[PDB]
Amino acid sequence: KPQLVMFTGGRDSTLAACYLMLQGIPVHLWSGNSGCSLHRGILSHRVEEMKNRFGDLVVGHTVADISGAFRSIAIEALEQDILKYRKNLVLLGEKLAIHAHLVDFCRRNDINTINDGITHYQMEFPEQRLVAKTFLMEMMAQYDINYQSPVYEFAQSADDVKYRLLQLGISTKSLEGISIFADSFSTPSDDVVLAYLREKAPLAHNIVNFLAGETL
């Protein structure tokens, strides 16, 4: 019954968690700390709001250190990555790293649905494009994991997410940390997003294998 939600504290992943819980689906909130987030403290205010409105349906909050996988995939070869694609795709790497950790986490805790707060209105960002959602859906499916985005189609604008949150008696603010990498990049082409993901998939599967104790 319980499913995982990739939960940052921001409005989009909050609404995704909340909508699932409204349906009677318990959620394990999963927060990945990639090592470069500033002022993350406000997250726990958001978590309290949700335990207050949904009770037992919030089954868990995990904060996971994913700095090592993030660094391996996105930072270690930054000079090469940027010279090649002429774009700073660290935050796309970060999502790959998340997904790698979630494979291990799901296997080790008997979870086979994962959910995030990707939104149609934020397609400007690499990690939130159909080409990357499709790539990662396929990736997770290879390990029998269902990857859903329960607010993707509904969220045509930020105002859409804001007002439903408000109807749940939850705050409209994004109560998350910010990446230091925020606003450190221009928009990449779809083709480049997908070539990057495919360039880093080997590293990511490798890390999955490592975390499972299978290899290297």
Ligand X SMILES: Nc1ncnc2c1ncn2[C@@H]1O[C@H](COP(=O)(O)OP(=O)(O)OP(=O)(O)O)[C@@H](O)[C@H]1O
> Interface residues with ligand X (CB under 6 A)?
6-8, 10-13, 30-32, 34, 98, 116-119, 122, 125, 127-128, 174, 176
Can you read off the two tokens belonging to residue 54?
């949904």
Instruction: State the binding partner of 154 from ligand X, a second copy, none, CB within 5 to 8 A by kind.
Output: a second copy
Q: Taking contact as CB under 8 A, which single stretch among the options 78-86, 114-122, 123-131, 191-199 is the one that binds a second copy?
A: 78-86
Rounded-to-integer distance, Cα 15 and Cα 11, Å: 6
Q: Give 57 or 69: the residue with its C-beta nearer to ligand X.
A: 69
> Cβ 85 to ligand X, closest distance in Å?
19
List residues binding a second copy (CB under 8 A). Answer: 15, 19-24, 35-39, 41-42, 45, 64-72, 75-79, 82-83, 86-88, 150-151, 154, 159-160, 163-175, 178, 180-181, 183-186, 207, 210-213, 216
